[PDB]
Structure 1
Amino acid sequence: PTAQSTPLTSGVNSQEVPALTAVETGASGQAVPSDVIETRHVVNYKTRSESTLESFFGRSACVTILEVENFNATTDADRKKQFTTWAITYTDTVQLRRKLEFFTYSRFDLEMTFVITERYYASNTGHARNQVYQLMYIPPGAPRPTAWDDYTWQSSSNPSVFYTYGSAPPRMSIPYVGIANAYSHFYDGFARVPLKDETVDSGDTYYGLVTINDFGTLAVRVVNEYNPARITSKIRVYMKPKHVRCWCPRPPRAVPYRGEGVDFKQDSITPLTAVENINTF
């Protein structure tokens, strides 16, 4: 299937007036060149292959950067650097989020890929053996780790991936996991109805998707015990929507995001550059 060919047409002198319409109807303009000019025949062999939803979304996009370290931790703050937890979302970054938000609703499977990098913190503390990482998916309700070596990492039921530093970026597929018939990119509502004369506080409650969304937690640790040399790591998380359906198109984000909602920032709401004149080529 190809984009439209142009038919051979000459002029008209007619009560047929395809050049005029009334967009008050809610219909866009429909006229094509053959309606308003003399056209030659042009066979169009070109296709819209690369603008299908699968093609538009068919890329692994970085959605977050996590940090973990491996060293002899003697304080609470340093113990908390030995592992990290991240609420799974696409809202830490802007590029994939903006593409998804052309649509109100979506349904897709997810390919998740990880890029893991290390550096030495210092040069005077000897060396470090090759590190193994555990990335544990903690679904809502499953116990979250409070230490890098607590019981939760035995991961009897949670999916974990063990990654050996220097090996191919680890990768797994996630089904469509939504509890609705599609994911909502926008939710015009609340998680509960506040009722007349209730004692529950209405002053610090939130609005929209943030009140209802929960895709669980990614927990990451270095499985190795500490070397004399402190190693600091970054874990880049990549998402690719696949087997994609989307509904109800939206205008794309025109101004910077300032969080997980649709809110905008007072110093960043002037996207257009003023032209010198309405007559500027």
Structure 2
Amino acid sequence: ARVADTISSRPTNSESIPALTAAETGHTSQVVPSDTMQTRHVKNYHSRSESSIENFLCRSACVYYATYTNNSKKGFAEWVINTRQVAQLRRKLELFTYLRFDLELTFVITSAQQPSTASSVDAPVQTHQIMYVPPGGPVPTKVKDYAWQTSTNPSVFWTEGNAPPRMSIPFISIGNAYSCFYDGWTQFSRNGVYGINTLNNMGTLYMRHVNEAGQGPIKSTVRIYFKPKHVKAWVPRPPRLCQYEKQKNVNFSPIGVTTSRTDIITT
């Protein structure tokens, strides 16, 4: 993807006006710097390969982290899948209005020892289970539940001390693209929920320890990473100026357009 090269030029005295235009037409001028001054011939070998949509968006970014305790009544974690609780991936995806990609999912699981009271605490290797429930299915209510039978829901098992678990997800949607912005309601009477919460229905993700609480409590933490593959994008958008405040909507507090200086001629 090489860039255009420079063409040599000569002194002119003519009727053609490249520098004069009209910006009132909504049309950006197509002048090169070899029209306003004398240039030399320069062969450019630079490429635009690092600014593609396939290269700008295909990196792993953290979206959530949750904790769950071993020695606890109903100690397990849940998360409703969205991309609006972090500030860095939300600003990158909201440069466009419609997106369409595959996904790559990676989990990072740690553990920590809690202040127990017994002597000679020695625990074996821990095993974790991460379950995905599509919308409409049965959900777990506790740790020893029948809902963890995973007969048709996809799940994964992992033992501590190995490579992190990874899997792929295709373009799961009902429409033809994902929508970052929705200007409308969910009811036909125009009441209630207004915004992007009317389109978010992706499921819930559950996490638990498979072992038993032997002689000491253990507190674990999972971290989730998103990586879009095979990306298409439509209708670009200005970047966000103000800071994000909530998750469901786009409410903000107003702020200035830039920072200030002391004069108009200050360099």
TM-score by length of 2: 0.94
Q: Cα distance, 1:29 vs. partner?
A: 2.9
| Displacement of 1:270 | 3.6
**2-structure distance, mates of 1:150, 1:269:** 50
- Structure 2: where are the runs of 5+ without partners? none
Partner of 1:49: 49
Letter in 1 for 2:53: L
Work out which of the residue numbers 229, 234, 239 in structure 2 matches 1:242.
Answer: 229
Match of 1:121 in 2: 114
Which amino acid in the other structure matches residue 266 of structure 2?
T
> For residue 179 of structure 1, what is the amino acid of its counterpart?
I
Aligned to 1:230: 217
CA–CA distance in structure 2, aligned partners of residues 264 and 38 of structure 1? 51
* SS of equivalent to 2:34: helix
Q: Structure 1 residues 165 and 45 mapped into 2: Cα distance closer, same or farther (>3 Å)?
A: same
Indicate yes or no: 2:263 matched with 1:277.
Answer: yes
Note if 1:146 corresponds to 2:132. Answer: no
CA distance in 2, matches of 1:255, 1:96: 15
- Partners of 2:257 and 2:87 lie apart in 1 by 16
Q: Kindly, what percent of the aligned residue pairs are identical?
A: 49
Over 3 Å counting, the alpha-carbon distance change for 1:97 and 1:106 in structure 2 is same
Residues paired across the two proteins, number: 265
**Structure 2 SS opposite 1:169:** coil
CA 1:192–1:30 in 2, change beyond 3 Å: closer, same or farther? Answer: same
How far apart, in 2, do the equivalents of 1:89 and 1:271 lie? 29
Relative to the length of structure 1, the TM-score reads 0.89
Give the secondary-structure state (helix, strand or coil) at the position aligned to 1:153. helix
Q: CA separation in 1, counterparts of 2:82 and 2:249?
A: 15
Q: Which deviations, in whole Å up to 9, do the C-alpha atoms of 1:235-255 show, x marking residues without a partner?
A: 110000110000000001111
Q: Match for 1:32: what amino acid?
A: V
Q: Secondary structure at the match of 2:62?
A: strand
| CA spacing shift, 1:123–1:44, aligned 2, 3 Å | farther
Partner of 1:210: 197
Aligned equivalents of 1:130, 1:162: Cα separation in 2: 13
What is the root-mean-square deviation of aligned Cα atoms in Å? 1.6
- Distance of 2:111 and 2:256 partners within structure 1: 40
5+ residue gaps in structure 1?
A: 74-78, 196-201
